[PDB]
Design a protein around this ligand. Structure first.
Ligand code: HEM
Length: 117
């Protein structure tokens, strides 16, 4: 599926081919950016504090739990996606990985089934 690796500051370090397809950003364009470019407001402006709160309390809200959220593509379109966050260490500093599963089709079929009674 789509995978993203960021450093302890939310800056994208690695961006898989499938993440490019899904988000609309090539790997080169993404790598120097904050991960928040992939999400809409209010999460966007709050993501850095989500990361900071975790590094300070060590209390996970998504790590080891998973969560369905709304992500944002480059063209502006938003979409539902499941997210799993993993924690890793490299060169003494923390890095996090995000495995993403696009749930757009699921949301569509569900919504479609409901509108037909
Ligand atoms: C792109 C759509 C994304 C959205 C909407 C999103 C949203 C959120 C939200 C809502 C929180 C926790 C807020 C709370 O419950 O306290 C959070 C935590 C965090 N996110 Fe994301 N996130 C996104 C993607 C990512 C990705 C791709 C990564 C890593 C590659 C990531 C790294 C983190 C980390 C490290 C935390 C804190 C972990 C924790 O609280 O357990 N996020 N994110």
């Amino acid at each position: 599926d789509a995978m993203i690796v960021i450093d302890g500051h939310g800056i994208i370090q690695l961006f898989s081919t499938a993440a490019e397809r899904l988000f609309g950003w090539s790997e080169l364009e993404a790598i120097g950016q904050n991960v928040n470019i992939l999400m809409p407001e209010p999460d966007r402006s709050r993501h850095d504090s989500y990361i900071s709160r975790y590094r300070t309390t060590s209390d996970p809200h998504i790590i080891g739990i998973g969560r369905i959220v709304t992500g944002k593509r480059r063209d502006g379109t938003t979409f539902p996606m499941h997210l799993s966050i993993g924690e890793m260490q490299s060169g003494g500093e923390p890095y996090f990985t995000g495995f993403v599963r696009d749930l757009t089709e699921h949301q569509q079929t569900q919504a479609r089934l409901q509108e037909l009674q």
